[PDB]
Structure formats: structure tokens, C-alpha cells
Curated annotation (Swiss-Prot), chains A, B:
The record marks 115 as: Plays a crucial role in stabilization of the heme-bound O(2). It comes from the Bacteria. Changing residue 83 to A: Accelerates autoxidation. This is Methyl-accepting chemotaxis protein McpB. Changing residue 110 to A: Signal-off mutant that does not respond to either O(2) or CO. Disulfide bonds: none annotated.
Amino acid sequence: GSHMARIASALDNVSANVMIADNDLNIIYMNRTVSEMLGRAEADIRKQLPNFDAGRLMGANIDVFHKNPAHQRHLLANLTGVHKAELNLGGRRFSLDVVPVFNDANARLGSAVQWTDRT
Amino acid sequence: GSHMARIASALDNVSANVMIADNDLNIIYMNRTVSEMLGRAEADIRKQLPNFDAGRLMGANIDVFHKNPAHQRHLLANLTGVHKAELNLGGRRFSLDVVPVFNDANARLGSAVQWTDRT
Ligand code: HEM
Ligand code: HEM
């Protein structure tokens, strides 16, 4: 019944770091490699985001990590295909692959995001 | 359906190198990064598989690259969760994350494989 849960379970143990957000940009799943990766990156990320806490991402909204929350919400709300954003956080480089997820009626369910730590 | 076509399309442009095989172990989709990655690794892979051609992988059966094709077929047909294999090809190391793909009725459709070139 839940497509997001099916995708999360299938991807839980793959190499690719994958985080899944719902339509409100709440983080609802993180696979094992992404949790581990963000744990390692935590020190560096704090230099720019001092209150960032990797152990507390599940159930957090991504707003809090965005200067202008209205911008990402509009972009993300309107995605028809993959969006490749590139972030520099505290000296660390990340490529994000943002993948819009739909049901069989074309109704948007949320976003699957691949993280790649380029550094 | 087609669930595989949806998956292939959603992943066509992600960073993760992804290849998709059907129930008969025919390669039916390759995303962009996996094609490029296998193109770069072609010379080395030829040292061990002299007839390997990265440009001719689409539609090929993977039997041809396996010493005991019956082994992989049995293994793959029976997967319920991710299978993590490690390959050495012409001195190159690859991690494969093999993800069994099911429809919402639990009927197996094929296999999505993430490739990572560890070298
Ligand atoms: C939860 C950890 C996350 C952190 C720490 C983080 C941090 C950032 C930062 C620092 C920026 C740059 C602008 C700014 O700082 O105000 C940014 C931009 C952006 N974020 Fe993320 N973010 C996270 C998760 C996500 C997720 C899950 C998505 C999408 C589903 C996303 C989508 C975007 C987009 C779309 C932009 C700007 C897009 C562009 O201009 O290309 N973020 N983020
Ligand atoms: C298309 C290019 C491919 C090449 C060149 C390749 C090559 C190989 C090689 C050399 C082996 C080791 C067995 C042996 O040496 O005979 C192997 C094993 C294996 N292959 Fe692949 N293969 C490819 C694609 C795929 C795909 C798409 C799948 C999954 C659908 C797959 C699944 C496996 C599995 C399951 C094993 C055995 C894993 C284990 O026993 O741990 N291969 N492959």
C-alpha cells in the first residue's frame, strides 16, 4: 500500500546514500549508508550549520537547513524529473540527485534524494 | 505496468550506476553513469573477458559473462533481499548491490543492480 516504504526497504542496504522526504519536505526514511555518511560529515557541516545533528535528521524538516525555505518548496513541489543540486557544506562537497516519486495516478508522494560526498 | 520502465526512467540521470535485468537475465535498462563507467573500464575488463563490449550490453544475456550460468540464475531467481557481490575484472574491483524488484502483488519483475567501481 505504501510505495515510499517499499522503496525505503529495497534501498535500505544499498551502497548509494538515500534519504526520502515527503510532500511537506519532512524526512521519513534514511538508508544505512546515508546515516553513516552524514555522521562522518557532521563535524564539517557544523562549521556552517552549528545546530545540525545527524542523529536527529529522521522526522526533521529540511526547511531548517535552507535560508529561503519558500524557494526549495516551490522547486521541489514542481519537479517533473531529477534535479541535480550541488552543495558545499562547511568545506564539504555534496552532489544531490533529487528524484520525484509518484503513485500510479501521477499523484506526487515525495522525493528520493541520493547524496554523494564528492570530498 | 510498466514498473521497470518507471524505475529505469526515474534513475536514468542519477549518480548511482544502475543496470536493470529482466526475469530471463536479459539487460533491459542501463542508466547514463553505468554506461560511461563501463566504457571507461572496458580496456581492463577485456584482459579477463576479451570479447566484452560496453557498447553492446543492452539486450545481452548475463549468462555469457558467468562461468556457471546456472548458479547466478538460481541465486537471482530466489533473492528476497539485496545481494552484495564483489567482482575482480582485469584488476578492477566492483561492488554489486543486486536489488530484486517486485510489483505491488509480490510478483518478481527482474533485478536492478547498482555498480560501484571501487578502484
Ligand atoms: C537534511 C539535510 C540537508 C541539509 C543540511 C541541507 C542543506 C542545504 C544548504 C546549506 C543549501 C544551500 C542554501 C542555503 O544554505 O540556504 C541547500 C539548498 C537546496 N536544497 Fe538542501 N539540505 C538538506 C536536505 C535536502 C533535501 C532532502 C532536499 C530535497 C528533497 C534538498 C533540496 C535543496 C534544494 C532544492 C536546494 C537549492 C536548489 C538549487 O538551487 O539547486 N535538501 N540545502
Ligand atoms: C553485464 C555485465 C556483467 C559482467 C561482465 C559480469 C561479470 C560477472 C563475473 C565475472 C562474475 C563472477 C562469476 C564468474 O567469474 O564466472 C559475476 C558474478 C555474478 N553476477 Fe555478474 N556480470 C554482469 C552483469 C550482471 C547483472 C546484471 C547481474 C544481476 C542481474 C549480475 C549478477 C551476478 C551474480 C549474482 C553473481 C554471483 C554473485 C555471487 O555469487 O556472490 N551480473 N558477474
